DNA sequence: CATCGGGCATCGCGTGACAAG
DNA sequence: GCTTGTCACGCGATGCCCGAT
């Protein structure tokens with residue numbers, strides 16, 4: 001068709017859609033301001049909106065509104081610790097609905113004092129020397145919770161915040177700080193263990209077989225997941241597979257699944273020998289559902 | 291003068307007075323058009339009306355002024371710890387709110403995305419999925435969003451469906467809006483950035499127990515020299531899908547002094563797998579083997595999986611994938 | 619208690635200048 | 640040198656207000 005004419009009509013349509021958008025926004029403003037929706041023209045709606053915004057009023061949201069949105073989205077509590085000693089510099093009130101602990105228990109504490117001892121080492125690895133993401137077990141007999149932490153390393157002190165002379169923070173002199181959020185949270189698979197039974201390699205198909213993620217098994221002994229009436233049989237199988245190197249030993253036992261159910265599993269086990277010194281590197285296991 | 295222009299000037303005066311009150315820096319306000327001026331005015335009003343009904347401090351026992359200053363920024367601190375951005379989306383797929391950090395992850399300005407169709411930011415093939423997540427409450431899914439940074443970024447959305455009060459729909463009850471946090475994704479593998487000629491050499495005992503390592507090796511694998519020799523032989527470092535290949539090539543090296551090119555995965559100190567193309571040589575002393583010198587070059591995941599697809603021997607566990615740990 | 623014409627105010631439409639990209 | 644969009648402007652068709660019937 002005529003190029004000039006279709007350009008003209010497209011432009012007219014664009015302007016008409018712009019006008020319609022403007023009037024729709026005017027109607028939204030009339031719906032949003034106080035006594036407009038209790039009808040007026042465009043100018044009065046605009047003046048009343050101007051007055052209402054003058055009443056209401058840089059960031060689009062206040063700090064508390066942003067915090068509210070984040071917490072409503074995915075819970076969590078903010079903690080700022082020092083990377084030197086783990087000293088808890090700040091902790092929000094959200095630690096109470098998350099860990100069932102008052103703010104006082106964390107203030108004057110250190111991050112290592114609030115999580116499981118077996119994780120302390122790991123936390124050091126996460127605190128030595130931008131983004132950080134890890135999983136630990138925090139306190140609340142003592143009871144622990146798996147807590148996922150996502151945060152970042154920030155130069156201390158922070159900008160904008162005043163640090164008075166008589167403040168407890170005035171003498172610490174920390175250079176870096178971790179600012180993070182903590183939140184509550186028939187196939188087969190192969191695995192490699194040490195001669196004592198500790199999961200040192202876990203196939204990803206574990207999820208489809210026992211319901212665990214690989215990280216939930218690595219480091220733990222396989223006997224911890226086995227039924228007590230089969231624990232000694234499994235331990236004897238692991239003991240004898242070491243003595244008969246290269247030989248394959250099969251053992252059937254009950255495995256505690258993710259739902260804490262009992263799954264009957266057949267485990268084939270043999271040893272991997274160093275091709276120079278013939279020493280056992282690890283035990284290869286194929287664990288199959290039955 | 292004439293009546294039409296006078297009315298238009300009265301409208302423009304009201305529009306500019308609306309713009310001067312928007313909660314944005316003036317360099318953002320000055321480059322706004324009238325349409326987005328009205329749009330973000332509506333957005334501010336809707337947000338304030340929602341927070342008036344949904345919203346409303348350190349313990350007085352734990353009150354110091356420095357802690358008070360930290361509390362007055364707690365919101366920005368959470369936002370920066372998100373590693374991503376906030377997104378509140380109405381039932382009409384309109385962006386009720388998006389935090390500023392979206393610009394850091396997608397390149398879109400906050401003032402341009404608020405009160406707009408969220409589908410404009412989402413890949414078409416994924417839009418339907420998002421809609422199915424917009425209609426128990428807790429939500430956890432993945433979507434590819436448009437990325438203008440320097441074309442699309444896959445992102446994990448973790449959120450909830452909650453009633454968006456104070457919207458004055460016509461009087462309709464509030465609709466379920468999605469409050470979510472969008473974060474990037476994760477791979478468990480180390481690819482070098484300066485990949486090219488990052489060849490590093492390692493020294494080993496005859497049983498492939500590390501004894502020395504060069505600087506580039508400490509950079510690639512992430513172990514210190516002392517840490518590399520305290521975890522047993524190198525077979526504790528090898529992916530379970532490569533242990534038999536490494537053993538076969540170790541036998542070859544024992545037999546003829548040279549192993550040949552072998553592609554396999556080493557376990558970093560971050561418990562990640564990194565591909566290496568290696569060649570293990572036997573050094574001698576008085577005619578008897580003394581130690582091993584292995585010169586490795588890091589590979590990308592692409593070249594590594596190509597080598598695995600073109601594997602010489604067919605061996606058990608060849609296509610197995612998994613995670614590992616290492617102790618001393 | 620309306621109804622009726624004045625003249626100015628609202629308002630939607632199409633087009634042209636102008637500019638970012 | 641083309642495309643999409645913003646802003647202003649001219650222009651009628653109704654709107655509102657209000658003396659004057």
Ligand SMILES: O=C1C[C@H](c2ccccc2)Oc2ccc3ccccc3c21
Nearest residue numbers: 492498524527536539540549568570584
């Ligand atoms: O070259 C290596 C790397 C590695 C290693 C390097 C650094 C740290 C830990 C482990 O062990 C090996 C074990 C068996 C091999 C067989 C053939 C060729 C190379 C190897 C190698």
